[model samples]
Target: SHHHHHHGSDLGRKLLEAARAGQDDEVRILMANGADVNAADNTGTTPLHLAAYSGHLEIVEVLLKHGADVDASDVFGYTPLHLAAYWGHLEIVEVLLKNGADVNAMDSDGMTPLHLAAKWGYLEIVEVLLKHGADVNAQDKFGKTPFDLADDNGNDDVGTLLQVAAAADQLGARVGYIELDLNSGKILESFRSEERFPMMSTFKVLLAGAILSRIDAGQEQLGRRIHYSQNDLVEYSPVTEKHLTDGMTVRELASAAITMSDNTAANLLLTTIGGPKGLTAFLHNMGDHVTRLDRWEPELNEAIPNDERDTTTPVAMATTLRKLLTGELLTPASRQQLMDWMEADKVAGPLLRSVLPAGWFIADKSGAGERGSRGIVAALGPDGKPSRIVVIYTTGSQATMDELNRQIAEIGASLIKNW
Candidate 1:
């Protein structure tokens, strides 16, 4: 059952042969003797791929121990897990999954390892993938779900498994969320994090941070009080509407904008920073080119699909949050104040906070509006100086705020608890 191909160096070919032929001793000996563990053939096929494709479990384990790239994709975008799933090598699939292979990795055809498992009636593989957080909702190039492939292939068990796993997931909703490790600056987890969504009142966090930056530069003062008339009052300005005559300091306005999500308070602070244009300029100064604010409150939360106005991708917003809170953008006192304002939030407590277990420290802001827009950006952990920065956003979901918040909470809970 051997096939010959003219590719790779003689040494690489020998390793590939030993891997494909299940010669575990040869593999160990070669690796111990300075043979490259990750050397690939001309077609980008490495020893790990060969071992995985041939169901050589020992060779696979030995190669992984020698530093094989767990998620290495060949020229066809097929990872070792893809080959294992396609070949019905259940143990190899399990080994790859246990080693942290990207469960959602796609082939060149946009098919994931789960797709192959479902299509081939590998019910156990499907279950393992689901348990590993394989996206049950993942689609191929033709937008076919794993369940669809299972149904087409007469894999009823796989179909049923997918249905159960997908029951809690929100379908047809434009969802994006990301979690970053503040210490390493690495993306810990993400889904559709590059897609843009309307920032809504979450933009106020950036608005306040921008003001804090100016205050840190000595261009603004927290004690500077600004008065607003009844005519200047906008809807949802609970804190500011009451102080129409007494006026509020820059500090008070920033607090209300963040904690109470007061619209008029946000506008007052926006005006001090020169409005939406000024905020956009501040984001640019911080090296954040993706976040933009073009409109004032009520209009900015429109949540229109493909509308570039007043939008920020989850990655951009998370990056900006990191720069503001953990980076050098603000002085020590300013940073501490921003964190304090966010922790005193009146929103997200009933929603995001309820999902998290007790004794977790959370500093966050939440937003809601048109077209089912809802989002929360937070720093969460067991103490005040938490290391996790989570940003979640969604738009165009037919589900209500409660439903969307549930979905967001599910993601947050898993990431936090699992960490």
Candidate 2:
């Protein structure tokens, strides 16, 4: 019985290499022949850790079946579950938990798997971790539990998780719902309005409104194009350098910029449509004092300087939608075009879509940046009336971007559920 052998004390390396390559069969064979499934590399990462880190689920299952230590800690004291949760390997987390991995186990930084899930704002991962008994109260070295992490990180998705967990702990049921009259502009019932957080990809609603208004007034045209020389392309934007010499039509660029959140599209639109100065003038004319478009530099890009980032309030977002709906911002045909573009927007995350009933018409926009995020929804009510306008903005110590967005969706849905 001849078996392959590699050089000295490389046992952990061999196992890790096998797992990393997804050689599940080889891993099983190696472990069966006395390879220590739990052996740590120089970095203290076990085969299970490697499997989890690389998202090798079958390899993980093979290792676990061979009696690999499910709770084996790396140098950072992070068990396999931490890696799985952080990377959004929901199935791997489930397998690890089923095999006796501790969800409450903390890393050297004292962060539990739930903390990572919360920080990343993976809603499914958060739910799974909670279902598997991860403690919400478990604190990290910074005295921050998952809830505090969500609050501190401005992760609204995780904030929703925390609230639900709290409500379930206290009253055995989650919070109730809220109803609204979109036409009458009345709040008929009460429920938690997820606190306004950041407005990331959602701010484009205002920009779009401003651009459409200008175009409708014969101040601009959809067919208008902008040419950005190499000097005009802002540094740090995802807009590639190659596109600098390329020309884009105003309507096409604006639609792509807002719907897909394309940075280059935005910069080009901002430039041709009078930059922030022009956009601000349009917003001001529309009576939306809270909406501002602050970025208007040739060098500005994705890494907006702290002082230069655009800011907008939720109320301003609602007003922008209202203007579009009322045709106050653009001509009727232009308003319809703007709404059509928004409806076709590809960034339909849980936030705006989650609130709408099936077969309902929703015209909305969303925005996000490194600092925070926001979303707004305008839907026709069940009575076919102009339904309520919902705007949620969040920034500062909440949750991750995705988590915050989902929280916005859930909160919006709760608000409009009975409408």
Candidate 3:
């Protein structure tokens, strides 16, 4: 009766049990004695799945090295990464990601690792999967995205993160839109972009205002020269990469930040204008309670935020735009200067530029992250009149940067075409 079972299958089951128990050495011994790495139990869960399901990082490593199928799924089509994420095992999740486990591998219910992370309340692990390029917009069999589940389940931080990711997606999309009359500070439309979202380069709008506030307070000067070197160089900044100058004026850095989205320029400017916390106070003074920056440009560019990164609501951004345009935040001269810089960026023709007519005279700041686009804009009254102040801010979704640009172009055109 003992030999009635398949040859060496008992040893394989033993290996799975050892993995389930987190016995690394026992798993090794069983495998060394010809226990199959691919062995599945009566439930169709393999040693790899068992190790991952049991939250055993060392066992996962051993099983993976022994040629366990990293993408192996049980009868329910649950992959190792899904189990690790669902169980809230951050270390094991990291191990699985490192071994090239499919972060987006869907279960029978079309649930990805990110979905489980959201469903089970693994916030940091969700961030990790996002950084590893998990499709935040991926929908489950129920047609719910990670963000949807996070939002419904009260994972505010995760939901916000996913909203930001959704702003630019080809699908599984989330977008926020707000059009405010700067003259009256009244919203003409609320497209649900009022909730928190990843600020992206749109954060520079706040930073630029905060920097201007510093200069207005006589704490700094726009023409002040700051020094940079090869050591300060960061990625994805064509302007800095092209110039490589050690000393650039604060004014010039602002130009690089807003006009070009230069990472080096943004880092230098963030430090010069009092870090993220200081900017928080500055925005607070403007009655914007939600837009916050917690990381510098380098971390943002790497798409690996230390904590939650910058966040903002479309409503908050529109209010900030209103204050800046109405001279509540910056002096008229400085406001004029900021507008001038924005105007000089005329040919660059961002989404706002293309969306509105040339006569509208738009002053715009756009945030473009590795994943998507977010931005706010101030457009003068049809003929540069103050009587009709206008502001618009938008962010949301898991999407391509290119798609966001196209989306914004449509948004701007619609907003203006009917205005």
Candidate 4:
């Protein structure tokens, strides 16, 4: 499927043509013959601009090493980063950023790299630009920011990342939530669902799964008792410390871990199953990218000056629970047990519990943060039937969490009736 490339003998435009043709070796040869790295074609596009516009990453590297201006713009003021983002050339965009390409540079349209990345459905490129300080709120000439462009293009993944980025005005506390019809696999309601958030104890859901994972792997038995010593004494584990006897079956520990939020029991399972790395693999297999069980407890892993912690997005949490309820990964009995633990009903407040009708049921977990933050995730409905999965996390003023909790509960209440 390749065609013969014709490199003409016009020395004036040879280097530009070579760069545009993606001929890396030819570009090098021309540059060695005193070809100006910044030479422009008729449209004011330089060789570097052509290389980037054509996605010649290798040629980009070569020209950049030869003093090609990283931020040089064409007639339209589009830099290499702008072109790279537009075409979803993530690696080429990364190289330009590494060499000091301004992430916030505006094109003729006043669009930043984020604007192009989001508009084109380049999720990774959007993430990278955000990490390097691209302003998601920057408006283009038409007064549309990257988030608006993402919404216009129906790029939910890119839109969600920008949602979190644009939450600077809301006290830097970001939240995400989603509700899905488990039976039909339809998304019922959502807000910034794909954005990742810090989950303090909600992660116990996966910790229990990691243990059950070991059981399914034929490495352990459910009835086998595990003894916990002083070294296994993890803080915030009052439930296990006060009541749990010398040792309990793995079955008993898993139940305690999820229902009671027993930090020790969670860490106990994590320790036996090879710590954070093992659980990380399990979540990754589920298509989750940002959730990391970097260490057992936040304090145990909080070595200082780091974001090391457990995390999950509303999307990942809701999807995993849906899969569990649908018997995608766990056996029927195992799924029932896991749901039963979450259903012993820990966070059934007037705010969230009001959502379920008299006939429906919910298994839920909730957390309140140091700042104005509180959240709850609910698995609603009954077993072996249609269910609604909801995951909500919020941070900021206590008032903010309160409003979010009440707002989400009202939506769930309405869906049970209308949806």
Minimum summed lDDT over a 10-residue window in model 4 is located at 1-10
The ten-residue window of minimal lDDT in model 3 covers 1-10
lDDT of 4 by residue, 267-348 (tens): 7777777888888888888776667777666453322222436566787887776776566587676677777888775544
Q: What is the lDDT of residue 334 in candidate 1?
A: 92
lDDT (0-100) at residue 262 of candidate 3?
77
Question: Model 3, residue 46: what's the lDDT?
Answer: 82
TM-score for each model: 0.65, 0.49, 0.55, 0.66
* Model 2 stretches with alpha carbons more than 4 Å out: 1-198, 229-246, 296-309, 372-374, 377-386
Off by over 4 Å in 4: 1-12, 168-199, 210-253, 264-298, 301-331, 348-419
lDDT per residue (tens digit) for residues 312-413 in model 1: 999999989988888788998998899999999997765568876677788999988798888999988775457788898867878867787776676666
RMSD of 2: 18.6
Candidate 1 off by > 4 Å: 1-113, 116-171
**Model 2 agreement with the true structure over 1-419: per-residue lDDT tens digits:** 01111223556568878987888788877877788777666566778888997889999988898888888876667788999998989999999999998889877789999998888777678877877777877878889888887777876646754765654344322222223444454544332332232345555666677777778778888897777676655543453454666677787777776566666676666666678777777778767676566664322223232343455544455555666756444678876777677767676656667667766766667655443333454444554334666555443323566665665576665445434
The runs of at least 3 residues in candidate 3 whose Cα sits more than 4 Å from the true structure, single-residue gaps closed, are 1-170, 242-246, 301-308, 346-350, 373-376, 384-400
The Cα RMSD of model 4 versus the native structure comes to: 7.8
Estimate the TM-score for candidate 2.
Answer: 0.49
